[PDB]
Amino acid sequence: VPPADQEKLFIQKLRQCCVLFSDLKWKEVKRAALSEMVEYITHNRNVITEPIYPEVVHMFAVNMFRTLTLEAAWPHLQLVYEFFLRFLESPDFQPNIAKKYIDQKFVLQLLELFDSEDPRERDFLKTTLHRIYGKFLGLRAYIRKQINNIFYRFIYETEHHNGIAELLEILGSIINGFALPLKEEHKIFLLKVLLPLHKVKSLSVYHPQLAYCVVQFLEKDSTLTEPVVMALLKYWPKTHSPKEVMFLNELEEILDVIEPSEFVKIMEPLFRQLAKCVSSPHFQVAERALYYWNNEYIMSLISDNAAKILPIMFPSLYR
Amino acid sequence: PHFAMPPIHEDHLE
């Protein structure tokens, strides 16, 4: 008995995975069907046809778009994340056909899953949205607007979102790909959203990703250097806290990118703060600040402006 | 850069 062609089996397998769950029997059937379909689209060409696009997006929405540490049926959900990634990354993938089903409502529901407590799920969501942003040109502006709103609600309202760091990782690759002169909206996003993110109590959870976005902005356009540095000194822990190691880490990564033209404009308030870190009661804060002297580029920057920096770093040596 | 993801070039229209 001929068991129908390959495209029909693909559609039926996708619809089997829409029946949400002999409990161990049917869960194993869907797990085998997902792994079977993963291998199908990975090692075959011309298998993602037009009727496949709605079946795949529907199966993903039925399994993933739900009401929300680790997941219960995660080995089942991981296969759906993996199949959908191979779906987006396949050479047969045509965004002109998929945009009828991967739209603003799909993206909006995908972003709400970033609040998941499962780090493995947030990592699959991070990569999924990264592929969607890169391949759907008509959704790029909408995706950044929603990320901007998520960050805004995280700063000035109920300040908790379990995926702030994952969203910053996506933005980092977006900022790294910005074009010739920056759009004015990008500079507004840096000075009014990315910089206020340094005040939140849980900064250490996402500080390495936030610091990468800040140095990528200054690496694109060096004009933002003064308002960026002055904001860091504003949000700097005025109390003697071990959190200053993060700021000292971010400040040196800026100095490895800073231009001599902009460095003169903020050097005095910078090293005045840096001098107080050397005098900190916390050994780790002073240890990190003293490590600046090993940076040959900072040394050259201080040498070309030795008349005003050295009196600050050594107040007893001068006069 | 450790956690850096592949960059996405701003070569589209908005």
Residue numbers in the entry:
A (entry chain A): 33 to 53, 61 to 107, 126 to 376
B (entry chain B): 728 to 741
Manuscript excerpt for this entry:
The PP2A holoenzyme is a heterotrimer, composed of a scaffolding subunit A (PPP2R1), a regulatory subunit B (PPP2R2-PPP2R5) and a catalytic subunit C (PPP2C). Thus, it is the highly variable B subunits that determine PP2A holoenzyme substrate specificity. Proteins containing validated LxxIxE motifs bind B56, an all α-helical heat repeat protein, in a deep, highly conserved hydrophobic pocket. Here we describe a novel dynamic, charge-charge interaction for a major protein phosphatase, PP2A-B56, which significantly contributes to our understanding of the diversity of mechanisms used by this phosphatase to select its substrates. This novel interaction is mediated by a patch of basic residues that dynamically bind a highly conserved acidic surface present on all B56 isoforms and therefore constitutes a novel pan PP2A-B56 binding motif.
The MS analysis shows that a subset of the LxxIxE-containing B56 interactors are regulated specifically by the acidic patch for B56 binding in both isoforms. This includes the mitotic regulators KIF4A, RepoMan (CDCA2), Nance-Horan syndrome protein (NHS) and absent in melanoma 1 protein (AIM1), (ratio WT/2R > 9, p-value<0.05; Figure 1D,E, Figure 1—source data 1). Analysis of the primary sequences of these regulators highlighted the presence of a conserved basic charged rich region within ~15 amino acid N-terminal to an established LxxIxE motif, which we defined as a basic patch. Similarly statistically significant reduced affinities were observed when the basic patch motif of RepoMan, NHS and AIM1 were mutated (CDCA2/RepoMan 563RKKK566 to AAAA; NHS 1618RCR1620 to ACA; AIM1 716KRKKAR721 to AAAAAA). A crystal structure of the KIF4A1192-1232,LEPE:B56γ complex showed that while the LxxIxE motif is well-ordered, electron density corresponding to a single conformation of the basic patch bound to B56 was, as expected, not observed. A crystal structure of the AIM1716-741:B56γ complex was similar. Namely, while the AIM1 LxxIxE motif was well-ordered, electron density corresponding to a single conformation of the basic patch bound to B56 was not observed. Finally, we show that the presence and contribution of the basic patch is important for a number of interaction partners to bind PP2A-B56 underscoring its relevance and generality.
